[PDB]
């Protein structure tokens, strides 16, 4: 019985990793994730220049999940590239680097410089397509023409296999269209579903106030709120992108939640809110819990059940 | 006490009603909602002809909410019109009739017939814009040019104040576009936010199976999963449509949840999943709970706090 995976020409001890943005912003964070029992790690989505991000409070968690409008605080691309080129211990586990430029040009500039490090050290790119583009237009993955432009430009500039981080969709026509755009790009080898459910609003009844300061309290939702949404997206893209891997993200708190993601199609399984709340010890727990479900069912490997969710009649 | 309010030229004993689709399909259902303590009721969204809807199982509930792909089973427009015209007791409470035709023409045909009954009896129209669209396109409310056409045609055909049931949105640019569309139509006097969060997927770990038969287990989510989504949409439209009313729907299980909807801007508060699970007794509980929270805070009216959610700075 084992959790091993071999994919994207890397070996992973288990499918668990952080979700971008959680426990991955500083060198301290990345050393911490490297020391944990996760199978991989991803660095904080970066911009060319460092960002402070939004005013605090900008993240809050609750029993059913989290809300955030962080504003992309990060130490800048050069820092993350340095970590990938010089600091990361690749004998411990594989590293993904997430990028999230504010324009197609900012992304092209980053990927051009990443590429030799990707080639030499094996760092893997995750391109975050929730980047805002022009304010007053939707986020890039909700503007299909922009998404196509971004992927054309990044594919030409980078020239190596990479993956994309997608927001959730809520309409079958959007699953269809979004997957068809991704399927135009053979270098897109993995699809991470999902980023946070956009622009929710948590209100505290006692104070009669929103709980985060930016955007009048509106921000992206993670956690237990979003698990069925995340599963839907994992499976929609699993079905529509048969030549790509799907990584699942959203609502993972337990080995059972991971097992559902993997039934839906997930290869790697990312952990955001639950990791933010519990800390890196969560990885040993998730591994144990997943293995126990596998033993009960008689499953010896992940591929025995990946994508094998049953439908009714 | 008491929670009585006036709107749309009608008096309501309290702000609570069923959500369309729940406990409102048959004459029995509508008599049961009328006998309840709710302040109003809404009939099941209808088509010109009766529909059997999708194969069962097509609804399932769980601790955090519900998933459905009902396929609009309904007794047909003639039935609901006859209920509004001949059977409903208007001395007990107001009635809303929901329509969701499969094309603009079908909506126009239904609303031309409804108009005289609305004049004579005061039945209120809720137009459900989560309805099918032309090939390749998403649901009408997700296609802003279709939505505008539908509202143009229904406004002309009906000629009387009505409301619109909206799906959730997840992007601030979409809130801006959708609200601008609604604000073109002066006859649209109330906006109900939100319909179910579209195309989630619930998977049962033991069986390794989806839990509803239609659409490979994909369906709309309601209940606790969707409360922050619902609040965000209520507040977004409340802010953007100052000359309209907003009705809140989504994730109401308690008077506290109703309180939060009202703080966000809700005039009426609709109850779907929790009503399906608990039955019509829920209405006395919600009223008692809401009045208890108001008393603890010193609020004597709903107007004192409707839309008064506080932001940080
Ligand atoms: C504080 C915070 C920061 C985030 N920053 C990023 C980011 O920089 N890039 C990204 O792709 N997603 C980001 N996300 C989204 C997470 O990666 C993840 O997609 C989302 O939280 C859902 O997973 P969960 O339900 O496990 O939280 C962030 C989420 C949180 C809570
Ligand atoms: C079984 C079922 C049937 C529904 N039918 C309709 C419908 O006919 N028309 C409609 O506008 N919404 C319909 N909905 C959506 C609800 O009105 C409501 O918007 C949704 O369930 C979110 O509220 P909740 O969190 O209270 O469940 C239905 C929901 C359920 C669960
Ligand atoms: O940093 C974030 O707010 C964030 N939060 C998430 O839940 N997921 C994400 O992908 C991100 C980063 C993307 C993002 C999301 C919202 C705003 C901006 C900004 F404009 F600041 F550049 C960037
Ligand atoms: O009956 C539904 O499945 C349903 N469930 C919801 O959570 N919200 C809804 O608004 C609806 C009805 C959506 C709808 C609206 C109009 C037509 C049709 C079709 F005939 F295609 F089944 C479906």
Swiss-Prot record, chains A, B:
Resulting phenotype, residue 1 to T: In allele DHOD3
Entry keywords, A to Z: Cytoplasm, Flavoprotein, FMN, Oxidoreductase, Pyrimidine biosynthesis
Functional pH dependence: Optimum pH is 7.
Pathway: Pyrimidine metabolism; UMP biosynthesis via de novo pathway
Thermal response of activity: Optimum temperature is 37 degrees Celsius.
Ligand binding (substrate): 44, 68-72, 128, 133, 195-196
Active site per database record: 131
GO molecular function: dihydroorotate dehydrogenase (fumarate) activity
NCBIfam families: PRK02506.1
PANTHER family given in the database record: DIHYDROOROTATE DEHYDROGENASE (FUMARATE) (PTHR48109:SF1), DIHYDROOROTATE DEHYDROGENASE (QUINONE), MITOCHONDRIAL-RELATED (PTHR48109)
This protein's name: Dihydroorotate dehydrogenase (fumarate)
């Amino acid at each position: 019985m084992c959790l091993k995976l071999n994919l994207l020409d890397h070996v992973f001890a288990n499918p668990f990793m952080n979700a971008a943005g959680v426990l991955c912003s500083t060198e301290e964070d990345l050393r911490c994730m490297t020391a944990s029992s996760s199978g991989a790690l991803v660095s904080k989505s970066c911009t060319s220049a460092p960002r402070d991000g939004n005013p605090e409070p900008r993240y809050m968690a609750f029993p059913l999940g989290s809300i955030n409008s962080m504003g992309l605080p990060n130490l800048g691309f050069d820092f993350y590239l340095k970590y990938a080129s010089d600091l990361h211990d690749y004998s411990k586990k594989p590293l993904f680097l997430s990028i999230s430029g504010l324009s197609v040009e900012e992304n092209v500039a980053m990927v051009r410089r990443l590429a030799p490090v990707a080639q030499e050290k094996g760092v893997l790119l995750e391109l975050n397509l929730s980047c805002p583009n022009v304010p007053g237009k939707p986020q890039v993955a909700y503007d299909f023409e922009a998404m196509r432009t971004y992927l054309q430009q990044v594919s030409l500039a980078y020239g190596l296999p990479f993956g994309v981080k997608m927001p959730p969709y809520f309409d079958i026509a959007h699953f269809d269209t979004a997957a068809a755009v991704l399927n135009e790009f053979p270098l897109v080898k993995f699809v991470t579903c999902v980023n946070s459910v956009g622009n929710g609003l948590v209100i505290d009844a006692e104070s009669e106030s929103v709980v985060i300061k930016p955007k009048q309290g509106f921000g992206g939702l993670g956690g237990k709120y979003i698990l069925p949404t995340a599963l839907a997206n994992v499976n929609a893209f699993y079905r529509r992108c048969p030549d790509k891997l799907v990584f699942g993200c959203g609502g993972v708190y337990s080995g059972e939640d991971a097992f559902l993601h993997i039934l839906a199609g997930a290869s790697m399984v990312q952990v955001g809110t639950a990791l933010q709340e519990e800390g890196p010890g969560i990885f040993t727990r998730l591994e144990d819990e997943l293995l126990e479900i596998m033993a009960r069912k008689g499953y010896r490997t992940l591929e025995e059940f990946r994508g094998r969710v049953k439908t009714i009649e």
